[PDB]
Each structure stands twice: as structure tokens, then as C-alpha cells.
Design a binder for this molecule. Structure first.
Ligand SMILES: [Ca+2]
Length: 124
């Protein structure tokens, strides 16, 4: 889940908006835009999309509804660091593995908070 990994992304970042620091950042980060990224940090957003989708196809989840942003979450947060769920099949826990390894790209990565806000011309 996206709104549900977001609440813990704004603990991951000491922080404020879990996206919008990302929605408009390079090309897209997390939410918005289309194509390919800019940063190492923006690469976990090319793939929080490429391993975010596949919940639709899944070994455990293959029907109608869950396509871009929805399945998981039942978490925590410490310093900055959380957990993910407390239930699991792949349906929730596979989607949770790309969400939390994106809270690890998104709290930390080879970060740059620098090309925020962008335009998608120079940027994408
Ligand atoms: Ca994105």
C-alpha cells in the first residue's frame, strides 16, 4: 500500500510529505510523471512501479482490482525504521517488500535533495 507505506515514509524522513518530496522530483519519484528517472534515488521510483505493479499478476494475487498502489501494511516506526506487515501471503507481503525497500531507498539511498520540483525537459 501507498498511503499506508507513506505514513512510515514521513517517519523514514524526520520529515513531512512522504511523496511530494518525490511526486515532482527529477521526473516522477513515487507518484507522478512518466518514462525513466534521473538519480540513484529516482531509480527505486522506476522500480516502485516495476516491482509495484506485479501484485496484479502475482503467484498469490491474480484477479481484478490491485494494479498500481493498494495491497499491504500493518507496521511500526523506530528512529526512522519500521517493519511492514503482520499477516502475509504474497498479496500483502510481496507488495510490502517493494514498499519497505523503497522506504530504504527513500529515507537513505545515494540520495540528492537537490533536483526536487523539476519540469521534465532538462529533467525528463
Ligand atoms: Ca513513479
Amino acid at each position: 500500500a501507498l498511503w499506508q507505506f507513506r505514513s512510515m515514509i514521513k517517519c523514514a524522513i524526520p520529515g513531512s510529505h512522504p511523496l511530494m518530496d518525490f511526486n515532482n522530483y527529477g521526473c516522477y519519484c513515487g507518484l507522478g510523471g512518466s518514462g525513466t528517472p534521473v538519480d540513484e534515488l529516482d531509480r527505486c521510483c522506476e522500480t516502485h512501479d516495476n516491482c509495484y505493479r506485479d501484485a496484479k499478476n502475482l503467484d498469490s494475487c491474480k484477479f481484478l482490482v490491485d494494479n498500481p498502489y493498494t495491497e499491504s501494511y500493518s507496521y511500526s516506526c523506530s528512529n526512522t525504521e519500521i517493519t511492514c506487515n503482520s499477516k502475509n501471503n504474497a498479496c500483502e507481503a510481496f507488495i510490502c517488500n517493494c514498499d519497505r525497500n523503497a522506504a530504504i531507498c527513500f529515507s537513505k539511498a545515494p540520495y540528492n535533495k537537490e533536483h526536487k520540483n523539476l519540469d521534465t525537459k532538462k529533467y525528463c
